[PDB]
Design an enzyme around this catalytic site. Structure first.
Site, mmCIF file in Angstrom:
data_model
loop_
_atom_site.group_PDB
_atom_site.id
_atom_site.type_symbol
_atom_site.label_atom_id
_atom_site.label_comp_id
_atom_site.label_asym_id
_atom_site.label_seq_id
_atom_site.Cartn_x
_atom_site.Cartn_y
_atom_site.Cartn_z
ATOM 1 N N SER A 195 26.760 52.850 33.856
ATOM 2 C CA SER A 195 26.387 51.455 33.258
ATOM 3 C C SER A 195 25.103 50.985 34.227
ATOM 4 O O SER A 195 24.180 51.927 33.969
ATOM 5 C CB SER A 195 27.525 50.473 33.364
ATOM 6 O OG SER A 195 27.261 49.414 32.384
ATOM 7 N N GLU A 322 31.909 52.424 23.645
ATOM 8 C CA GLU A 322 30.991 51.573 24.647
ATOM 9 C C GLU A 322 31.027 50.013 24.320
ATOM 10 O O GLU A 322 30.998 49.173 25.372
ATOM 11 C CB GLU A 322 29.816 52.211 24.691
ATOM 12 C CG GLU A 322 29.685 53.434 25.024
ATOM 13 C CD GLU A 322 29.774 53.740 26.543
ATOM 14 O OE1 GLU A 322 30.095 52.906 27.443
ATOM 15 O OE2 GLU A 322 29.520 54.760 27.138
ATOM 16 N N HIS A 435 34.082 51.209 27.434
ATOM 17 C CA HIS A 435 32.980 51.125 28.601
ATOM 18 C C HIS A 435 33.743 51.131 30.143
ATOM 19 O O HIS A 435 34.427 50.029 29.970
ATOM 20 C CB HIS A 435 32.088 50.165 28.458
ATOM 21 C CG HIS A 435 30.947 50.151 29.346
ATOM 22 N ND1 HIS A 435 29.845 51.167 29.301
ATOM 23 C CD2 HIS A 435 30.394 49.504 30.380
ATOM 24 C CE1 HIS A 435 28.989 50.888 30.011
ATOM 25 N NE2 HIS A 435 29.211 49.778 30.814
HETATM 26 C C1 LIG Z 1 32.254 47.008 35.436
HETATM 27 C C2 LIG Z 1 31.900 48.021 34.323
HETATM 28 C C3 LIG Z 1 30.273 48.145 34.148
HETATM 29 C C4 LIG Z 1 32.681 49.407 34.671
HETATM 30 O O1 LIG Z 1 32.441 47.711 32.976
HETATM 31 C C5 LIG Z 1 31.980 46.438 32.495
HETATM 32 O O2 LIG Z 1 31.038 45.685 32.916
HETATM 33 N N1 LIG Z 1 32.907 45.943 31.841
HETATM 34 C C6 LIG Z 1 33.847 46.542 31.092
HETATM 35 C C7 LIG Z 1 34.956 45.565 31.073
HETATM 36 C C8 LIG Z 1 34.334 44.072 30.805
HETATM 37 C C9 LIG Z 1 33.998 43.588 32.303
HETATM 38 C C10 LIG Z 1 32.907 42.716 32.121
HETATM 39 N N2 LIG Z 1 31.815 43.319 33.087
HETATM 40 C C11 LIG Z 1 31.523 42.305 34.492
HETATM 41 C C12 LIG Z 1 30.247 41.923 34.610
HETATM 42 O O3 LIG Z 1 29.384 43.127 34.202
HETATM 43 C C13 LIG Z 1 28.027 42.812 33.531
HETATM 44 C C14 LIG Z 1 27.522 41.511 33.605
HETATM 45 C C15 LIG Z 1 26.191 41.089 33.019
HETATM 46 C C16 LIG Z 1 25.637 42.080 32.204
HETATM 47 C C17 LIG Z 1 26.244 43.456 31.784
HETATM 48 C C18 LIG Z 1 27.603 43.676 32.577
HETATM 49 C C19 LIG Z 1 27.909 45.117 32.248
HETATM 50 C C20 LIG Z 1 26.948 45.656 31.305
HETATM 51 N N3 LIG Z 1 25.976 44.492 31.289
HETATM 52 C C21 LIG Z 1 24.836 44.821 30.274
HETATM 53 C C22 LIG Z 1 25.157 44.689 28.849
HETATM 54 C C23 LIG Z 1 25.579 45.464 28.094
HETATM 55 C C24 LIG Z 1 25.924 45.190 26.917
HETATM 56 C C25 LIG Z 1 26.065 43.894 26.274
HETATM 57 C C26 LIG Z 1 25.508 42.946 27.120
HETATM 58 C C27 LIG Z 1 24.968 43.206 28.420
HETATM 59 C C28 LIG Z 1 33.563 44.850 32.818
#
Ligand SMILES: CC(C)(C)OC(=O)N1CCC[C@H](C[NH2+]CCOc2cccc3c2ccn3Cc2ccccc2)C1
Ligand SMILES: *[C@@H]1O[C@H](CO[C@@H]2O[C@@H](C)[C@@H](O)[C@@H](O)[C@@H]2O)[C@@H](O[C@@H]2O[C@H](CO)[C@@H](O)[C@H](O)[C@H]2NC(C)=O)[C@H](O)[C@H]1NC(C)=O
Ligand SMILES: *[C@@H]1O[C@H](CO[C@@H]2O[C@@H](C)[C@@H](O)[C@@H](O)[C@@H]2O)[C@@H](O[C@@H]2O[C@H](CO)[C@@H](O)[C@H](O)[C@H]2NC(C)=O)[C@H](O)[C@H]1NC(C)=O
Ligand SMILES: *[C@@H]1O[C@H](CO[C@@H]2O[C@@H](C)[C@@H](O)[C@@H](O)[C@@H]2O)[C@@H](O)[C@H](O)[C@H]1NC(C)=O
Ligand SMILES: *[C@@H]1O[C@H](CO)[C@@H](O)[C@H](O)[C@H]1NC(C)=O
Ligand SMILES: *[C@@H]1O[C@H](CO)[C@@H](O)[C@H](O)[C@H]1NC(C)=O
Ligand SMILES: *[C@@H]1O[C@H](CO)[C@@H](O)[C@H](O)[C@H]1NC(C)=O
EC number: 3.1.1.8
Length: 526
Positions: A195, A322, A435
């Site tokens: 990621s 994803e 994801h």
């Molecule tokens: C931790 C890990 C990376 C393995 O998997 C996850 O993040 N999740 C999977 C289960 C939900 C949990 C939320 N994650 C906590 C905070 O993570 C973020 C905070 C802010 C932006 C972020 C992320 C992550 C990506 N984007 C970019 C982005 C992509 C798409 C659409 C909008 C945004 C963990």
């Protein structure tokens, strides 16, 4: 067991793994704590110590906001920090095989978390299985996230941007000067990450100051050309200013603003980070990589398109679903606790959430390309479409486009499509192959027969672990002994990729061809 590093002696601890032994060094400092006068600045080199540093426990995680959408739920809480938050968090870990290796390939992990969150101490990043099983050395580091890691006043060295990326880089530096003392080969170093960790890895491929700090790279569900991965100098400065206003630090001397932000308590900076973007979302990369003229000399899309990056092999891949994980963090009609059948009007509302500043025509074009149903009446039509929209836009099509373009400059690339849903996955079934949930297979957690993974999953992890290690050692992610499907090179014309699943590993071509022509060729004009 004690290892003499360039900065002092460090003491590790012995771990029992699969009737074997792994030596873990948890919490080696690799930079001056970025505190006080040092907050927001590039990481500074570490002054030696005279004593024996005890590296027997994970160090502090860097300051960050916590996901609190599902208190008590292991599916979300497994990703939250499991050590104290502190600004004093520039430490790294080292797992080395026992007996001590002679010239071991080194694997360096870079965690994701949107550049706002993450920590190397998470259970699913435990490197002791890779060290035990493949006799590689595993290194992981904590790096600053959020405003404290990526606040940008471009040019101003008090807050130049990309500090967290320079944190990663100072850690790659440390491995180059020191890992030989641990039995590692500083000439055989493979970065891998997921990621935002994968986007980070792709940016180290572009950054001239990292060119000589690693050999090869692995990108799991991420790349810098992902629409969330790079903040514009416009957004960055607007965001720096809004943070200033929000904390009473607005000034005219740009440098005095930073001095003001340096007296605020870490928690006051954390609280106000979410609101620097008017389109406030928990999925907002409020503070991320910028074109700083230091780490990034130019806009990375230009560097990619014109071949300005490290010439080496890459391994890139994505997961089947994803996008689904993000749908329960704001999209209407979605819940992890039901099957989230949504209507056309809920789908339309979800596009507004995930594409906030996009024209009405832009959103209609997404709907048009994703609502030509194989069956009109399937009640999950809109629920599945919104997941595929978010995943194709945010992860799959950028990784594919990254691989095509990187490979057109003559380097071997290998692309995978991970489609196994963990038997232990705490999220509901409609979320699919989520994801982040290849990571435990990559790190060999299913190799531990004691924790309720099936036998098919043990075998799949074992093969994946072998392929990752052969890629790091030899530039070639084959499993050569167990009559395994051979993993072909990804070429811009053929676009062959390898599927990873418990049943039948097979070779396919042109993943999400139709969907990615929309996202990569048409949508950037809207
Ligand atoms: C931790 C890990 C990376 C393995 O998997 C996850 O993040 N999740 C999977 C289960 C939900 C949990 C939320 N994650 C906590 C905070 O993570 C973020 C905070 C802010 C932006 C972020 C992320 C992550 C990506 N984007 C970019 C982005 C992509 C798409 C659409 C909008 C945004 C963990
Ligand atoms: C750039 O920043 C301005 C200012 O943001 C506002 O103030 C911050 C401290 C924070 O609390 C934000 O939530 C605020 O929105 C943005 O201008 C605002 O835009 C929104 C809607 O677009 C509007 O409702 C506010 O009244 C505006 N406030 C002011 C002072 O103009 C602006 O949208 C940001 N983005 C861009 C691209 O310019
Ligand atoms: C699936 O659940 C969502 C979320 O609702 C919440 O979680 C549920 C598990 C339950 O505990 C609800 O009481 C919670 O409010 C449902 O979305 C809600 O739907 C109702 C009626 O359609 C609406 O009044 C709310 O505004 C919705 N909340 C949203 C959109 O956030 C959804 O309807 C459920 N779907 C199915 C098929 O069961
Ligand atoms: C560093 O550790 C030395 C030895 O610690 C040994 O291992 C740890 C894990 C404990 O189980 C301890 O009881 C053992 O003796 C200490 O003697 C030394 O004081 C420590 N130094 C510092 C600065 O903490
Ligand atoms: C480790 O391998 C490199 C080549 O990859 C070699 O140059 C170096 O001398 C080796 N070091 C050893 C065997 O200690
Ligand atoms: C104030 O701004 C000037 C330039 O206008 C700069 O040289 C100076 O360092 C700033 N003062 C402080 C205390 O940062
Ligand atoms: C190959 O198969 C054997 C069983 O015959 C198994 O023990 C071993 O782990 C497999 N190796 C790999 C790399 O998958």
């Amino acid at each position: 067991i004690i290892i003499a590093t360039k900065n002092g002696k460090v003491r590790g601890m012995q771990l029992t793994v699969f009737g074997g032994t792994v030596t873990a060094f948890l919490g080696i400092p690799y930079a001056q704590p970025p505190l006080g006068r040092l907050r927001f600045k590039k990481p500074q080199s570490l002054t030696k110590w005279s004593d024996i540093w005890n590296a027997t426990k994970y160090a502090n995680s860097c300051c960050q906001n916590i996901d609190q959408s599902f208190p008590g739920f292991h599916g979300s809480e497994m990703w939250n920090p499991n050590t104290d938050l502190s600004e004093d968090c520039l430490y790294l870990n080292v797992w080395i095989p026992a007996p001590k290796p002679k010239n071991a390939t080194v694997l360096i992990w870079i965690y994701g978390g949107g550049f706002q969150t993450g920590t190397s101490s998470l259970h699913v990043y435990d490197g002791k299985f890779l060290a035990r099983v493949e006799r590689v050395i595993v290194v992981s580091m904590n790096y600053r996230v959020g405003a404290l890691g990526f606040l940008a006043l471009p040019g101003n060295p008090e807050a130049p941007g990309n500090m967290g990326l320079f944190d990663q880089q100072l850690a790659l530096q440390w491995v180059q000067k020191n890992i030989a003392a641990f039995g590692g080969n500083p000439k055989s170093v493979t970065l891998f990450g997921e990621s935002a960790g994968a986007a980070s890895v792709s940016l180290h491929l572009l950054s001239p100051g990292s060119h000589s700090l690693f050999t090869r790279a692995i990108l799991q569900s991420g790349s810098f050309n992902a629409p969330w991965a790079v903040t514009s100098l416009y957004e960055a400065r607007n965001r720096t200013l809004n943070l200033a206003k929000l904390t009473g630090c607005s000034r005219e001397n740009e440098t005095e603003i930073i001095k003001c932000l340096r007296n605020k308590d870490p928690q006051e900076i954390l609280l106000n980070e979410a609101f620097v973007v008017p389109y406030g979302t928990p999925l907002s990369v409020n503070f991320g990589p910028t074109v700083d003229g230091d780490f990034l000399t130019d806009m990375p899309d230009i560097l990619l398109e014109l071949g300005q990056f490290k010439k080496t092999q890459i391994l890139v891949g994505v997961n089947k679903d994803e996008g689904t994980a993000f749908l329960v963090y704001g999209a209407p009609g979605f819940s992890k606790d039901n099957n989230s059948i949504i209507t056309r009007k809920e789908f339309q509302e979800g596009l507004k959430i995930f594409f906030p500043g996009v024209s009405e025509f832009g959103k209609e074009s997404i709907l048009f390309h994703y609502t030509d149903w194989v069956d009109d009446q399937r009640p999950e039509n809109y629920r599945e479409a919104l997941g595929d929209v978010v995943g194709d836009y945010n992860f799959i099509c950028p990784a594919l486009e990254f691989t095509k373009k990187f490979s057109e400059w003559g380097n071997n690339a290998f692309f995978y499509y991970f489609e196994h849903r963990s038997s232990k996955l705490p999220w509901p079934e409609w979320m699919g192959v989520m994801h982040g949930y290849e990571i435990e297979f990559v790190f060999g957690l299913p190799l531990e027969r004691r924790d309720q993974y099936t036998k098919a999953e043990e075998i799949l992890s074992r093969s994946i672990v072998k392929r990752w290690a052969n890629f790091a050692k030899y530039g070639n992610p084959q499993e050569t002994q167990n009559q395994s499907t051979s993993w072909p090179v990804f070429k811009s014309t053929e676009q062959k990729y390898l599927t990873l699943n418990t049943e039948s590993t097979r070779i396919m071509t042109k993943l999400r061809a139709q969907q990615c022509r929309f996202w990569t060729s048409f949508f950037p004009k809207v």
